[PDB]
mmCIF file of N, CA, C and O and ligand atoms in Angstrom:
data_model
loop_
_atom_site.group_PDB
_atom_site.id
_atom_site.type_symbol
_atom_site.label_atom_id
_atom_site.label_comp_id
_atom_site.label_asym_id
_atom_site.label_seq_id
_atom_site.Cartn_x
_atom_site.Cartn_y
_atom_site.Cartn_z
ATOM 1 N N UNK M 1 33.783 -2.047 -52.445
ATOM 2 C CA UNK M 1 34.830 -1.244 -53.156
ATOM 3 C C UNK M 1 36.180 -1.472 -52.492
ATOM 4 O O UNK M 1 36.256 -2.102 -51.426
ATOM 5 N N UNK M 2 37.229 -0.962 -53.132
ATOM 6 C CA UNK M 2 38.610 -1.038 -52.643
ATOM 7 C C UNK M 2 39.018 0.199 -51.833
ATOM 8 O O UNK M 2 38.488 1.320 -52.068
ATOM 9 N N UNK M 3 40.010 0.013 -50.935
ATOM 10 C CA UNK M 3 40.399 1.082 -50.019
ATOM 11 C C UNK M 3 41.946 1.273 -49.983
ATOM 12 O O UNK M 3 42.697 0.268 -49.993
ATOM 13 N N UNK M 4 42.452 2.507 -49.948
ATOM 14 C CA UNK M 4 43.871 2.780 -49.851
ATOM 15 C C UNK M 4 44.087 3.865 -48.794
ATOM 16 O O UNK M 4 43.460 4.959 -48.891
ATOM 17 N N UNK M 5 44.956 3.573 -47.801
ATOM 18 C CA UNK M 5 45.444 4.569 -46.795
ATOM 19 C C UNK M 5 46.928 4.953 -47.066
ATOM 20 O O UNK M 5 47.824 4.110 -47.095
ATOM 21 N N UNK M 6 47.218 6.230 -47.314
ATOM 22 C CA UNK M 6 48.571 6.725 -47.531
ATOM 23 C C UNK M 6 48.978 7.620 -46.362
ATOM 24 O O UNK M 6 48.711 8.831 -46.363
ATOM 25 N N UNK M 7 49.569 7.024 -45.322
ATOM 26 C CA UNK M 7 49.869 7.774 -44.095
ATOM 27 C C UNK M 7 51.020 8.734 -44.397
ATOM 28 O O UNK M 7 51.795 8.675 -45.353
HETATM 29 ZN ZN1 ZN B 101 34.638 -2.670 -50.378
#
C-alpha cells in the first residue's frame, strides 16, 4: 500500500 506523513 501507499504511505503519507503530514508533519
Ligand atoms: Zn506498501
